[PDB]
Design a protein around this nucleic acid. Structure first.
Ligand code: ATP
Ligand code: ATP
Ligand code: MG
Ligand code: MG
Ligand code: MG
Ligand code: MG
Ligand code: MG
Ligand code: NA
Ligand code: NA
Lengths: 116, 527, 65, 151
RNA sequence: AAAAUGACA
RNA sequence: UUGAGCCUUGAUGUGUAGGAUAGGUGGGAGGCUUUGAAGUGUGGACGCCAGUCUGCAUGGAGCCGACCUUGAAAUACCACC
RNA sequence: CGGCCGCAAGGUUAAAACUCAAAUGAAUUGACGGGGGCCCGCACAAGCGGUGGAGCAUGUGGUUUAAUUCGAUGCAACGCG
RNA sequence: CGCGGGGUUGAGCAGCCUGGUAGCUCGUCGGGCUCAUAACCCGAAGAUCGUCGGUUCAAAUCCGGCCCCCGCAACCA
């Protein structure tokens, strides 16, 4: 309820999964939808198409709030990084702007090594 | 608040539930679970007061109008759609039927004058002037339009037969005891309509459904009736499962803690027993060994019936090969062409919504109903086993279980291969003598499975097999069907049954009959 | 990284802010530090860049084209 | 295949009607090197089909074939250890060949009588999105739109 | 993704 | 702030068949309207979304009830809940 | 082994008996790589028809017999001399 | 010859848990893949459930008797 008319859409795209959370400008989540939760278990959730389904599903479960202006914040690498922004404009949402919030540490914590 | 006070019932020669007692009352919904053949509906009848226990008392509520739903959705077929609902209320229906002996008896006496004078007054008290006024509106509210109110109950699809049988219980109803409400499987739209209806209005309810998801979405308690008694766990269903499994593995663990703490005590008593310096110590725990008294482990009533369908004669080329049916009853034909082939495939799980006509399509295919004009034909070597949606014409004529199961079979000994197929599916000597017309639900379905196993047919029509099964017989039948090497059709509404094994799924609609997308997962994905 | 261009985009086309940080640091800082693998991959990095100058200086060939 | 390219194989037009589409249809259902029977079956399966459809050849056959041809077909794309199949667009030269191949495969079934009635009943039911041959265009479409997750 | 081995003259 | 009990007041409630969103109990057919109406324009809240509803001035004093399809009779009113 | 150093792990100085006619460095020609590039063959891909299942003819392994004559036995022996 | 635990396919094991389906992992055999052996894929073979009797329609299961094996006990001034 409360009819939020101006909100945010945090896209947390990873190598494995693409997860979309729509929230108001105060950072209080309304609804969320992921790539793997749309019947894309396994390697398929790491597909750009699975993000398109995830974004369109996240348009629902928040359509009652009547959000009209979005402020998308992309984050992280992955193939479901760009195909999901274009899936928010295809549901009628008006993206006011696009921002990238990706953590680039200034040589902070030591990274892992676990691949050979 | 209705209470059971040490209730026991003995059917045959072994008690069903031994000395049960529990309190029901409040805005809660005690859905109860149990393997078919073990209490459940009998306990519901005891609570309703229709049947009395062999020991114990109903301890009935004073005048609070227990409102009930029965297991049988076909027991009402002659009373009209507007008659069943008005017959739901006893004291009204009985007085109406007695007052109907006025226009049919052309003779009236002095006592009969008083009786007709006072029965009309009782009818007025019981609102007979609005008895049919309050019924049609409820029937329209549930979703049954006017056009079929005075029509007979026979000409109704069972998904709506249940829709009317539910409304039959909706007359000033506290304490509604609903028997198996699904079966004649609802689409799923009707199921969600049910769940919203049930969980919106506030009353005390007792559900007995076998549908885990429906019970999760509806109920708050679980009055499981499994081992020998009715034990109630507060939980929807996934709390009940993790309660009744953890509390049983705990029983096994707390019993192994005794079975293994007796072992080393016995090792001591066996080693230092004749020793003069330690005999007084061995005899000190040889007597605490026998004062432990481990707690016994009962037997669960849920079992997997071993059912296996063979093949008498293998046909090769193709089986069905239907061209044009165009079957109709009252409206424009429910379907027109339905040209298709079989090719000795598997299933083609016919499905739709309630009232489309899948059951009558299967009736036309099996030949007990013939189309308006068309040809079906089967292979000259085709042997057809049939599991009807409603099977009441079969369990009749008062035969024993043994006699019913022996009336089948081709060349088999009377003592084995027919008393063995019975024991492979949950039957014993104390049960092979009870009458056929008294078994309940899943047991009748299992008897039908047994007759199919002995007839060994090539083509299994099998309308709606998963109706009254245990949820433990469902997967047994699933495995039996997927290991069966013949040809079959079936119109089950279950999701992960068609999704489990279907290959040639055929949906049916008033306009477009789709056919064979694939796994039906691809069908539901394309849709 | 931020693009406002308030009224007239209707289309992201923010490759200018996509080819600045996303490719390099993010998909590199996950592992492979080793404190001396970069110092030897760098020695090999333009042991071949100067090799192109020889190919740049290899313009004096006939090849009959 | 490897180095060169093949232009096309020149197939003579059908004797009875000047159609290059019908002539290839005869050859596809032709079996064991006997074109005498295949043209006898097709010609019989068209006259008894045209009279039902009311017109000679085009709506009898070309319409009966334009509604059975596909648009998207599926194939496998093992790249570097992958195991997924993909749907791909078919070229216009393979649509007719696929359509004719599907009809005969779905017409060699339905065993009732001689091929002349087997095929004519197959084409007439396939001319209205009803037959078992025209069914295959639906399955191949479902397998083409129910796995669009990869492109 | 998995692929180990082959007595001397 | 959130529950439960009580007192007072105000809102509150269809069919199947309709001019109409009729709780019974039946008392009754003449009250009700101007200690300003019939209907006009201004909107609160509820809303088997058609309508009730009430603050509101002006406009100034007709409407209702009966018959009526109907299981029932109509905020003609009141008491009892 | 001995000496020195060290909390310890050990470091440092430093042999012999016996045994082989070799061990090793750079480079050359081939072969090979689950190294790279280019190209070809019904090699794969797209298709059509088969073998492997059944009966029978025939050849070969074995087993048997007095003898079941000798030879061929990856591709390139097995409707072979 | 006093007390316990066991005998199921070539080997190690369930099922005996209140009676109605002879099963798991290795292994054996016949094909396939390979230059060839292993690995891998397909198909298959077996046993008197120690023996002998007993109620049961039906016993690996419940009961009685016997045989075989493996453990323990057979005490102190
Ligand atoms: N009147 C009767 N006389 C004797 N035995 C009966 C009688 N009614 C039922 N039984 C048997 O005793 C048990 C009681 O059946 P009941 O109707 O309680 O089953 P249920 O557990 O409710 O079954 P379901 O889950 O299929 O509805 C069943 O095993 C049945 O075969
Ligand atoms: N004997 C009959 N006379 C008239 N109408 C009938 C008759 N039998 C069925 N119908 C009608 O045909 C339609 C479908 O009937 P059917 O029994 O085949 O239902 P169904 O789609 O299989 O549904 P379900 O099995 O869930 O009851 C319904 O509209 C029903 O009213
Ligand atoms: Mg690690
Ligand atoms: Mg080795
Ligand atoms: Mg060196
Ligand atoms: Mg052969
Ligand atoms: Mg020879
Ligand atoms: Na029952
Ligand atoms: Na049906």
């Amino acid at each position: 309820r409360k009819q939020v008319s101006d909100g945010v859409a945090h896209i947390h795209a990873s190598f494995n999964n693409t997860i979309v959370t729509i929230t108001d400008r105060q950072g209080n989540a309304l609804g969320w939808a992921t790539a793997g939760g749309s019947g894309f278990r396994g390697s398929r959730k790491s597909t750009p198409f699975a993000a398109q389904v995830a974004a369109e599903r996240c348009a629902d479960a928040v359509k009652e709030y009547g959000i009209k202006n979005l402020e998308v914040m992309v984050k992280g690498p992955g193939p479901g990084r760009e195909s999901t922004i274009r899936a928010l404009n295809a549901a009628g949402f008006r993206i006011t702007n696009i921002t990238d919030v990706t953590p680039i540490p200034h040589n902070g914590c030591r990274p892992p090594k676990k691949r050979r | 608040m209705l209470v059971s006070s040490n209730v026991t019932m003995q059917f045959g020669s072994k008690p069903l539930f031994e000395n049960i007692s529990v309190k029901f009352g409040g805005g809660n919904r005690y859905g109860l679970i149990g393997a078919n053949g073990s209490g459940k509906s009998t306990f519901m009848k005891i609570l309703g007061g229709d049947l009395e226990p062999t020991l114990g008392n109903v301890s009935l509520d004073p005048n609070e109008r227990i409102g009930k739903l029965r297991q049988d959705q076909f027991a009402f077929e002659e009373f009209t759609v507007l008659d069943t609902v008005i017959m739901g209320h006893k004291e009204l229906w009985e007085v109406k039927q007695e007052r109907d002996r006025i226009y049919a008896l052309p003779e009236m006496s002095e006592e009969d004058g008083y009786k007709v004078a006072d029965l009309e007054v009782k009818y007025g008290e019981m609102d007979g002037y609005s008895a049919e006024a309050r019924a049609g509106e409820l029937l329209l509210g549930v979703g049954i339009p006017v056009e079929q109110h005075y029509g007979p109950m026979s000409e109704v699809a069972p998904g709506w037969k249940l829709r009317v049988l539910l409304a039959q219980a909706l007359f000033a109803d506290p304490d509604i005891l609903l028997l198996d409400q699904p079966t004649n499987n609802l689409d799923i739209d009707t199921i969600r309509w049910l769940e919203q209806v049930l969980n919106e209005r506030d009353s005390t309810m007792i559900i007995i459904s076998h549908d885990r998801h429906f019970l999760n979405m509806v109920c708050t308690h679980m009055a499981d009736l499994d081992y020998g008694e009715l034990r109630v766990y507060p939980g929807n269903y996934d709390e009940y499962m993790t309660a009744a499994t953890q509390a049983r593995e705990r029983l096994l663990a707390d019993n192994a803690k005794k079975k293994a703490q007796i072992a080393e005590l016995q090792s001591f008593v066996s080693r230092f027993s004749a020793n003069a310096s330690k005999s007084r110590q061995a005899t000190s725990r040889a007597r605490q060994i026998d004062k432990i008294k481990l707690e016994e482990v009962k037997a669960s009533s849920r079992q997997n019936p071993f059912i296996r369908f063979e093949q008498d004669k293998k046909l090769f080329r193709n089986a069905l090969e239907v061209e044009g049916l165009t079957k109709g009853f009252d409206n424009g034909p429910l379907f027109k062409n339905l040209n298709l082939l079989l090719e000795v495939g598997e299933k083609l799980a016919v499905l739709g919504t309630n009232g489309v006509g899948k059951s009558t399509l299967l009736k036309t295919l099996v030949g007990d109903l013939q189309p308006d004009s068309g040809t079906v034909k089967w292979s000259e070597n085709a042997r057809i086993g049939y599991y009807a949606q409603d099977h009441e014409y079969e369990f009749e004529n008062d035969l024993t279980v043994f006699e019913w199961m022996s009336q089948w079979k081709q060349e088999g000994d009377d003592e084995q291969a027919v008393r063995s197929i019975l024991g492979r599916l949950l039957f014993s000597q104390d049960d092979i003598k009870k009458p056929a017309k008294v078994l309940s639900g899943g047991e009748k379905g299992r008897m039908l499975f047994g007759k199919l196993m002995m007839q060994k047919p090539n083509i299994l029509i099998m309308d709606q097999p998963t109706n009254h099964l245990d949820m433990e017989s469902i997967e047994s039948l699933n495995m039996a069907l997927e290991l069966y090497q013949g040809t079959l059709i079936f119109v089950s509404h279950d999701r992960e049954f068609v999704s489990s094994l279907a290959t040639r799924i055929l949906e049916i609609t008033p306009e477009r009959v789709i056919d064979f997308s694939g796994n039906y997962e691809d069908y539901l994905r394309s849709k | 990284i931020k693009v406002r261009e308030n009224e007239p985009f209707d289309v992201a086309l923010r490759r200018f802010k996509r080819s600045c940080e996303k490719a390099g640091v993010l998909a590199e800082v996950r592992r492979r530090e080793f404190y001396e693998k970069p110092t030897t991959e760098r020695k090999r990095a333009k042991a071949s860049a100067v090799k192109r100058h020889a190919k740049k200086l290899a313009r004096e060939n006939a090849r009959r084209t | 295949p490897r180095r060169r390219v093949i232009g096309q194989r020149k197939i003579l037009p059908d004797p009875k009607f000047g159609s290059e589409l019908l002539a290839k249809f005869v050859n596809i259902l032709m079996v064991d090197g006997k074109k005498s029977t295949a043209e006898s079956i097709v010609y019989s399966a068209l006259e008894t089909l045209a009279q039902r459809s009311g017109k000679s050849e085009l709506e009898a056959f070309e319409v009966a074939l334009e509604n059975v041809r596909p648009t998207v077909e599926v194939k496998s794309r093992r790249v570097g250890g992958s195991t997924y199949q993909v749907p791909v667009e078919v070229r216009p030269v393979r649509r007719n060949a696929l359509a004719m191949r599907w009809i005969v495969e779905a017409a060699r079934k339905r065993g009732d009588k001689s091929m002349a009635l087997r095929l004519a009943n197959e084409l007439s039911d396939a001319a209205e999105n009803k037959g078992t041959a025209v069914k295959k265009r639906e399955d191949v479409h479902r397998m083409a739109e129910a796995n669009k997750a990869f492109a």
